[PDB]
Design a protein around this ligand. Structure first.
Ligand SMILES: *Cc1c(COP(=O)(O)O)cnc(C)c1O
Ligand SMILES: *Cc1c(COP(=O)(O)O)cnc(C)c1O
Lengths: 399, 399
């Protein structure tokens, strides 16, 4: 189970054309298993007849049927009925806000949201706050740029009901002390929405050991299809939630006088699922299971380190990176980000700049945007050199 | 632009393995263009670098960027910003209920829902009725099994605010007189949710000539990806709607004090889109545009006729088919549906039985379930013979 970066790399058909692909934290390239399972799914009938490809069809069904269990295995969830399909981390969090919090929250209740949250884990709370007369309370950063979990006892009041906290920022790659935050929140009877969109990729959460109430992530960042994500909830919480969308499949009986719902997870999954997305995510998970994530992520982090140490030698560098993360957000003094993104792309280096859906974090860091190079296990030491060499030449052209 | 069934048929890689595929109204097979565009999308970087497949990458971008316009062209919508991406007809209708109706509806307002509606166009109305103290009012069927649009003046009151009406039933294939219903509803100041999940496939609605307020459909029935659908709304209505999910992309500015939203359609599209679904749907639409839908649908309907006339010669047949539809729902006296589905599948015939997410319609028809064979332009006269021959033998084994 020894991680071999060249073995991992060989599985990604896009890699040759992609150049030096350093934007995995926006979205990941896919291994051949995800490409092939999706191609089979769309190249075969989903019906009950197979005159020549029965083997391939039985595989697809087996991938679909095992898919909740593959997510449960990634999170150490105790059973697969705690896994709910969504179209992404965004939908998952809105489902918790609307189906769990909205029916419960009273005027004046408080929702503590960290300053490092992606918009996905902030906007739905501002909305449900408006809807219920509840209030969003800021969790600030500490001096090392992580949500200040030590502040929580001071910020928790009798009115505190929900904590929304990201396991890992898509800007700094920082992870707050999540075990401690959850200990403090639970002493106060609160429930915690953990945004795992980056955390599931890099440090997938053991939701039992961490006692996580709700955990959300997206397939497309976890080497997998677009349009699919997960909500994990403790079984009692999924049971406590109101239904989400209404329609087929989430009901048992329906008449003009009312309806009876399925139990979770189906209660929360109206209409035709994104079958291609569930099958491709299952394929991504089954492919990923062959790799030790600790070794893969240590490799990715080591490349970010090489890059950050090198870039730190050039005039005007600033890094926003925390905890030797695989994600390297940075700036250069006297450089327009979009110019640098474009010049890097001419050198065959794919990365991005912008606000990263993290306006309050950036405001707090005193910037309007950052460049961000993120490293994955299909990157190499030569990708780091290519990045640094391209930056040198961009600086020469721009500064 | 002469329709040629053999030309249309040749485009579907699944067909050989699929046998005689008669379940298109549950979900459609895909043409090679949708398979290939999805394979390219997942086999290439979505980033800014392409060292060898720049041509393929520019195509994918062009498919994505033209995709709203391809939907607008199918519906004769006046502009592409009236097209909103969803994960399916179900989400589209819930978005209209939650974002348009819920903020407006007062205790006692009335929502008229036809007895022929799929659950997708009934459950979200029962939910928003509960939420707002509004009431769902039944639109009954006439003697020909269509929603009784002539009854509408009698059923419309001062309190009537919304009409939910299916353009085409997924059971009977029946289409109510939609122009007239919309005339009556609009005289009353009401808005109309038109469920087009089947109608977009067979008789795609001209939303201008029909003056449709909201129209919904799903990609997977329109020869296209799972996990993608459309909401069309008149521009003033999309503007009037509250935001749907909160998160990235649907906002401009976000802080702890509030947020400003994009205008429609983006206002209503939080988080990372289902990019593979948008690109594959665009590919399905561009492929479909080469065919005259009138000729294709007349061919599909002609096969359903051949099948229904033949099956009507066997003892115990009952048909639920309306208007010589491409969809043929039926029963045989003294036959357990699931037995017949299984025996047909041994003969290589793929169809299904069940409630078709239409409990109130079935209750009204006096049945618990129907078989349903649905015909598409990739079906043939020999498929009709195969179906009839298999039924004969099933009857012999079962009755
Ligand atoms: C399929 C269907 C729906 C629901 O579509 P989903 O893709 O499952 O959201 C709604 N109405 C009719 C008439 C349908 O056939
Ligand atoms: C990507 C991301 C999201 C949102 O994911 P979608 O797939 O766009 O719904 C939320 N949080 C973090 C930390 C992310 O990186």
């Amino acid at each position: 189970n020894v991680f071999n970066p060249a073995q991992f790399r060989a599985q990604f058909p896009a890699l040759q054309d992609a150049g030096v692909y350093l934007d995995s934290a926006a979205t990941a390239l896919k291994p051949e298993a995800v490409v092939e399972a999706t191609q089979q799914f769309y190249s075969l009938s989903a019906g009950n007849v197979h005159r020549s490809q029965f083997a391939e069809a039985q595989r697809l069904t087996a991938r679909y049927e095992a898919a909740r269990e593959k997510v449960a295995q990634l999170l150490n969830a105790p059973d697969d009925k705690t896994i709910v399909w969504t179209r992404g981390t965004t939908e998952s969090i809105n489902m918790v806000a609307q189906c769990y919090a909205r029916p419960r929250l009273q005027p004046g209740d408080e929702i503590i949201v960290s300053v490092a949250e992606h918009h996905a884990n902030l906007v739905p709370w501002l909305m449900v706050a408006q809807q219920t007369g509840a209030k969003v309370v800021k969790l600030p950063l500490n001096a090392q740029r992580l949500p200040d979990v030590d502040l929580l006892p001071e910020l928790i009041t009798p009115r505190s009901r929900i904590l929304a906290l990201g396991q890992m920022s898509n800007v700094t790659g920082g992870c707050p002390d999540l075990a401690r935050a959850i200990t403090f929140a639970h002493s106060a009877g609160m429930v915690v929405m953990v945004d795992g969109a980056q955390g599931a990729v890099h440090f997938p959460a053991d939701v039992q050991q961490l006692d996580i109430d709700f955990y959300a992530f997206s397939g497309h960042k976890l080497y997998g299809p677009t349009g699919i994500g997960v909500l994990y909830g403790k079984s009692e919480l999924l049971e406590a939630m109101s239904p989400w969308l209404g329609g087929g499949k989430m009901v048992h009986e329906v008449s003009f006088d009312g309806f009876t719902t399925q139990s979770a997870p189906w209660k929360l999954e109206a209409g035709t699922p994104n079958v291609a997305g569930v099958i491709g995510l299952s394929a991504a998970l089954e492919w990923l299971a062959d790799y030790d994530i600790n070794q893969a992520e240590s490799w990715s982090r080591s490349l970010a380190t090489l890059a950050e140490d090198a870039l730190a030698k050039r005039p005007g560098f600033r890094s926003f990176r925390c905890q030797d993360s695989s994600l390297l957000a940075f700036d250069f003094a006297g450089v327009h980000h979009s110019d640098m993104v474009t010049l890097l792309a001419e050198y065959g280096i794919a990365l991005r700049a912008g606000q990263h859906c993290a306006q309050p974090l950036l405001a707090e860091l005193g910037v309007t945007g950052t460049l961000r190079a993120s490293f994955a296990p299909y990157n190499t030491k030569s990708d780091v050199d290519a990045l640094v060499n391209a930056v040198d030449r961009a600086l020469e052209l721009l500064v």
